C-alpha cells in the first residue's frame, strides 16, 4: 500500500547527481542533432514513468493490454504532478527531473505562459501551501493511474477497486500522520480537477515537446543558418 | 445547511407540468420559433443558477465582483452535473429542465458523439450505479461553486475556506448516511475530475450549439434570403 | 462593376440607428434577459450580412442550398473583416456594428485579449498602414463570400468563376485608383491568410459571444445577486 | 531571380530513388523499431528545409533571430505545400515516399479522413488542375516564408518588402508563362488561406501522427513493460 508506493516515488526520481544532468548528459550528448535527441529525451522520461508504475501494487497483475490503456491514459496528467510538487522549492518556474530550472520567462517566450502559469498557481503554489509529501503525491499518481474512466478497458471494475484501496490508504494515511488537519484528504483529492483541465491544456500546447525541444531545435536552427553555405 | 442547497435545488426542481408540457407537447411558446424557445430556456437555467448559489450558506457573503467571478468560472460544469444526475432516469439519453430528451443519436450525427458518450459513461452511469442522491449533488455543485482556483477574485483563501467547510460537510453526511459504505466521500470527489473535462470539452466543442442540428440552421437562414 | 459591390457595402453599412439602438435601448431594449439579448443582436447582425450578400452581383443566382453553403462557411471571417477596417476610425481597440467601443485592456477581461491583439496588428493595423478603403474591403468581402472550397457546394467551377470576376475588379480599380501602388492588389490579397486564421481563433474563443455578451451578463448576474 | 526559387525548389525536391526503393523496401533502416523512422524523417525534414531558406535570395541577410521566427512560424506550411504538390503524382492520394502511399482508407480508420479530404479538395486537386509548376510553387512557399505577421520579428516592414519581392516575380512568371490566364496569379494567391488552415487543423490534429496509426505506440509502451521489471 502507502509505503510500496512511496518506495515507487523515491525509487525512480532523484540521486543527488541526476538532479545534475544524469547519464553525463550535463557533459555528455551534447545538444547537436534536432528530433532524434529529443524523441530521446521523451522516451526515456516516458520510460522512468513505466517503471514507476510497475512498481505500483497490482498495476502488474493487470492484463498487459490495459497496463498500456491506462498509460496512455494518464501519463500527462503522471508527469506534471511529479514535476509541479517538485518545483514547490522554488517560487519562479519549474525544476525538472535533472534538476535544471526552467523560469517562468522561457515558458512564456516560448508561448506557453498562461498554461504555465496554471500549473504554478493552482498546482504548485497549492501543493506548497498544505506542504503535500512524496507519500501523499505517491498515492495521488496511482490514484490518477488506476483512471476507470481510461477507453478499451477489459475491466474498469477491477480498476476501479484498486483505486479504492489506494485511496482507502491515502486516508489511513493522513488521519494517522496529520490528525489535527481533518480536511487534508480532501484537499489532496481536490486538485486531482486541476491537474486535469491543466493536462489538456498542455496536450492541446505541446507543452511537453516545446519544454524538452525548443532548445535544442533552436540552438541546431542558429548552428546551420550561419553555417557555410 | 444544504438542504436550504437541496431546499435551493428543490425551489427549482422541476415540477410535473413542465415535463408533461415538453414531453408531449401541451406548451405554449409554439414551436414554430427555434432561436425564442431555446434562449427563453438558458435565460431561466441562468435564472434558476443564480437563485440556487444565492440560497448556497455565505456564498452572498463574498464579495460581489467574486460572486459573479464565481458562477462564470463554474455555470457550465454545475449545469452538467444537473443534467446528468436527472437523467439517471433515462438511458443513453440525457434530460434537460424541460423534459426535453436528448438520445445520443442526435450528438453523434451532430458530430458531438463522443462527448455526449462521456457524459453518459462517466457523469450518469457513475451516478446511477452508486445511488448519488440530490444532497450528495447539491454538496459536489456547491464544491464546484467554490472554485478557488477563479481567476481575478480578491480572496482565495475565504473560497477554499467555504470550499472545506461544504466537503466537510458532505463527508460529515456520507459517514451517517452511508456508514456502511467507508469510500462513498471519496467516490463523490472522484467524479468531479470527469466533470472538469467534459466541461472542458463541451465548450470546446459548443457541444450545445451542436445538438440543435444544422436543419434549424439552414431553415430561418433560407428564411432570411427567401422572404416574401 | 466594382461600385454595385461598393453599394452593398454603404447600405448594409452599420449606419446610425443600428449603433444607438442597441447602444442605448431605443428598441425596447434597456436590456433584461441576458442570453436573449445576445441571439436577437447576433440574429441581427447575421440578417444584415445576408441582405449584403443578396446585394452583390450574382449571388442570388446561384442555387438556394449553394447560397447557404457559402453564408455558413464565412459569416465569420465576414464579420471580422468588417468590425476591422471600421475599428480603423479608434486607437487600440475594436468598434462593433452595434456602435458598443470595446477596448483592449477592457477587453481582455483576463479572457481573450490574445486574438485580440492579432485583430489589432494582423488585420485593423495593417489596414489602417495601406488606408484600404470601402471598395477594396468590399471587395475582398465578396471574394470571401465566393469561398469556391465550402464543403458541400454543388458547382464549385461556378463560384470560383464569381469570384474572379470580383478580384479582377478589384485589380483593375487598384492600378487605377493607386497608379503608384503596383503590388496593392496583391498585399489586399495577402490579408486573407491572417483574416483565415483569425476567424478559426474567433470560433474557439467566442470571441464574438463574449464580445456582445459580457457586459449583458454581469448586468444580469448584478441585479440577481444585487 | 525567379529562378534562385525555383533552382531553391528544385533542388530540395525529393529524388526518384525515395520514392522507388521505399515504394518496394529497397531502402535501409530496416522497418523494424519506427520509433526512429518519424524522428530521423523529421530530422531530414528540417534539415533539407533549413538549406532550402537559405538559398532564398535575401533570407539569410535578415537577423538570426527573424530567420528563426520565419522558420518556426512557417515550417508546417512549407511542408504541406510540398508534399501537396508532390502528391499531383499519386492518385486521389498523398506521397510521402513509398509507393502511391495513403489514401482515405488510412485517414479514416486513423480518423482524420475529413482533413484528409479538405488536402486532396483544397490543394492537390487544385494544384493540378491548374498544373501548378515548381516555379508557382516555390514563390509561393517564399511568399509563405516571409510571413511579416510572425510574433517577435525585429523588423516586420522588412519581411513585408521580402515578400512583395516574391510575389511581384511571381506575377511577372505567371503573365509570361500564361498571358491567356490574366487571373493566375491571383488564383495562386488565393490557395494560401487554405494552406493556412489546413496548416493548423494538421497541427491540432497532429494529422501525420495519426495515419501512422497508435500501435506503434502500444507496441513502444508493451516494449518498456515488458523491459525488465
New interface residues.
Given amino acids: 500500500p502507502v509505503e510500496r508506493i512511496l518506495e515507487a516515488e523515491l525509487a525512480v526520481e532523484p540521486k543527488t547527481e541526476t538532479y545534475v544532468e544524469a547519464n553525463m548528459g550535463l557533459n555528455p550528448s551534447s545538444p547537436n542533432?534536432?528530433?532524434?535527441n529529443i524523441?530521446q529525451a521523451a522516451?526515456k522520461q516516458?520510460?522512468t514513468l513505466?517503471?514507476w508504475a510497475?512498481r505500483i501494487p497490482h498495476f502488474?497483475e493487470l492484463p498487459?493490454?490495459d497496463?498500456?490503456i491506462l498509460?496512455?491514459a494518464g501519463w500527462n496528467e503522471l508527469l506534471i504532478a511529479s514535476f509541479s510538487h517538485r518545483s514547490i522549492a522554488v517560487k519562479d518556474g519549474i525544476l525538472l527531473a535533472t534538476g535544471l530550472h526552467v523560469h517562468r520567462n522561457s515558458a512564456h517566450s516560448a508561448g506557453v505562459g498562461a498554461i504555465f502559469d496554471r500549473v504554478l498557481?493552482?498546482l504548485v503554489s497549492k501543493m506548497r501551501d498544505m506542504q503535500m509529501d512524496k507519500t501523499e503525491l505517491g498515492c495521488l499518481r496511482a490514484?490518477v493511474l488506476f483512471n476507470p474512466?481510461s477507453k478499451g478497458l477489459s475491466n474498469p471494475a477491477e480498476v476501479e477497486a484498486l483505486?479504492?484501496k489506494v485511496?482507502?490508504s491515502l486516508?489511513a494515511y493522513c488521519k494517522h500522520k496529520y490528525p489535527e488537519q481533518?480536511?487534508r484528504?480532501?484537499?489532496l483529492?481536490?486538485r486531482?480537477?486541476?491537474?486535469?483541465?491543466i493536462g489538456?491544456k498542455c496536450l492541446?500546447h505541446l507543452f511537453f515537446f516545446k519544454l524538452i525541444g525548443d532548445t535544442p531545435?533552436?540552438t541546431?536552427?542558429?548552428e546551420?543558418?550561419?553555417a557555410p553555405?
Same sequence: chains 1, 4.
Fill in positions: 542533432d534536432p528530433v532524434t524523441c522516451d516516458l520510460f513505466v517503471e510497475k502488474s498487459l493490454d497496463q498500456v498509460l496512455r498557481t493552482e490514484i474512466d483505486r479504492e485511496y482507502a486516508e481533518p480536511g484528504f480532501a484537499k483529492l481536490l486531482l480537477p486541476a491537474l486535469r483541465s489538456l492541446e531545435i533552436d541546431f536552427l542558429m546551420m543558418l550561419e553555405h
